[PDB]
């Protein structure tokens, strides 16, 4: 997270950490708890090649990584069939937990938007995670969860910005309709935030607008971050998460 501060301890109860086996269970990717048995994340964190489920665990909302680990096993991985790379699209995946989570004040689900919500500019949105804090350098060894508030851009204005300083012809769509753009040169997601939730407060209710997907480096000029647009995939999500 570039910009912003340590998150308050109550504020984002749905945030998830994905851990890979090694010399220790290391954080590699974000996610969000959307149902007591289901985590929503990005597809490029887990695919397109198939992963052994022995090597993966889920950690629920810590304040600090590694300090108080309780590692949940994963029963199933479901990657959207259209995915192969994040710039093509469909960068969305589901994890089914082996055991259901006991919902609590400290652990609660986020709400998914109704398909009609478009999230125009001016929507108050935040992104959270344990990624890198500047373009080249790691989150320091206390490892606090960080938050930042980010401005939304319209897709056409965002696609135009990606053509500045590029050879790509203006007729070629870089930013697709399954995508969303947010952030600026001071305020962005970075490496290790991928798969984490973008949430906007609408009529008092927190809704997940997006999943951190890809970009041309952290906080670079004219290169806003690209998010997977959650409304585009609601029908695919509801084939598995029982609503």
């Amino acid at each position, epitope marked *: 997270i570039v910009g912003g501060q340590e998150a308050p301890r109550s504020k984002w109860p749905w945030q998830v950490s994905l*851990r890979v*086996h090694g010399p220790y*269970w290391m954080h590699f990717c974000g996610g969000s708890l959307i149902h007591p048995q289901w985590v929503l994340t990005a597809a490029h964190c887990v695919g397109p090649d198939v992963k052994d*489920l*022995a090597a993966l*665990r889920v950690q629920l909302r810590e304040q600090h990584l590694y300090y108080q*680990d*309780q*590692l*949940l*096993p994963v*029963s*199933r991985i479901i990657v959207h069939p259209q995915f192969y790379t994040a710039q093509i699209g469909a960068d969305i995946a589901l994890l089914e937990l*082996e*055991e259901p989570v006991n919902v609590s004040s400290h652990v609660h689900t986020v709400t998914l938007p109704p398909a009609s919500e478009t999230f125009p500019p001016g929507m108050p949105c935040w992104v959270t995670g344990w990624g890198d804090v500047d373009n080249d350098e790691r989150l320091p060894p206390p490892f606090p969860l960080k938050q930042v508030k980010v401005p939304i851009m319209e897709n056409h204005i965002c696609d135009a910005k990606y053509h500045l300083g590029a050879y790509t012809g203006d007729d070629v769509r870089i930013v697709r309709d399954d995508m969303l753009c947010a952030g600026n040169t001071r305020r962005d997601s970075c490496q290790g935030d991928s798969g984490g939730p973008l949430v906007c407060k609408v009529n008092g209710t927190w809704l997940q607008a997006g999943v951190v997907s890809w970009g041309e480096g952290c906080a670079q000029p004219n290169r806003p971050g690209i998010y997977t647009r959650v409304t585009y995939y609601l029908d695919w999500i509801h084939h598995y998460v029982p609503k």
Partner: antibody, heavy 121, light 109 residues
Framework: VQLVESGPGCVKPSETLSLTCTVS????????ITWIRQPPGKGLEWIGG???????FYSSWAKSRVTISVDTSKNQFSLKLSSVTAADTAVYYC????????????????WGQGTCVTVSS | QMTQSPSSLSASVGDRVTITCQSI???????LGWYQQKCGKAPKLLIY???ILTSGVPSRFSGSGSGTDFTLTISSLQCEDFATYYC???????????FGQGTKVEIKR
């Protein structure tokens, strides 16, 4: 990386059997342990296990009498079986599931060598 | 719950054999494995997830099964293959999981 059981070998009726499984180097932080029993001349029967989340699961018969627990300060897993009958005479094993599932038998990748326990007067 | 068949077999060195295991429910999501047990030893995992061969196992062994019926096959029995073999399966999460009865294999010489 290997598992070692420990236990009394010989026990008197109505005692409570205590077993411990110890992990020798590194730690099972993200791992499950299950307990397996083999009475003389039978096949394998499952007692129970503990998941990576510290959830516990017990068989159809074991819920009456068995408790399983973990102590990270010792790198130890423990089994207790109350009110033992002679029919509790068996070899007992601890085994690891590498996926961390607390109620699974299809992928027990690492086993101890086992402790035999005889119950007699 | 499961029934494993046959209870015993005996065959030549070099011979081609298979073991079958069947159940009244299908396994939850390929959760079936095969274990080998030898003269006073802990079981060793040979096959997991219906068909994945455990590393270090010689490619004599393979298995697969139609979701409710499962086979383990040995292409050419060695005397080193003298053992009991068990299927194990899992039918949900938390609930029904069990071993089979186990098959005893003697090698004729």
């Amino acid at each position: 990386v290997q598992l070692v059981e420990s236990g009394p070998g010989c026990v008197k009726p109505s005692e409570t059997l205590s077993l411990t499984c110890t992990v020798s180097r590194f730690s099972l932080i993200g791992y499950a342990i299950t307990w397996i029993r083999q009475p003389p001349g039978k096949g394998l029967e499952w007692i129970g296990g503990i998941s990576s989340a510290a959830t516990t699961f017990y068989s159809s018969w074991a819920k009456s009498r068995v408790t399983i627990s973990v102590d990270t300060s010792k790198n130890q897993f423990s089994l207790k079986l109350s009110s033992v009958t002679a029919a509790d005479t068996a070899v007992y094993y601890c085994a690891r599931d590498p996926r961390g599932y607390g109620a699974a038998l299809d992928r027990l990748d690492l086993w101890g060598q086992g402790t035999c326990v005889t119950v007699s007067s | 719950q499961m029934t494993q068949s046959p209870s015993s077999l005996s065959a030549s060195v070099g011979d081609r054999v298979t073991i079958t295991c069947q159940s009244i429910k299908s396994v939850y999501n390929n959760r079936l494995g095969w274990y080998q047990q030898k003269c006073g030893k802990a079981p060793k995992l040979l096959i997991y997830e219906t068909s994945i061969l455990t590393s270090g196992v010689p490619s004599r062994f393979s298995g697969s099964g139609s979701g409710t019926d499962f086979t383990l096959t040995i292409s050419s029995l060695q005397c080193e293959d003298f053992a009991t073999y068990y299927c194990a399966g899992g039918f949900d999460r938390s609930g029904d999981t069990t071993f089979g009865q186990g098959t005893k294999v003697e090698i004729k010489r």
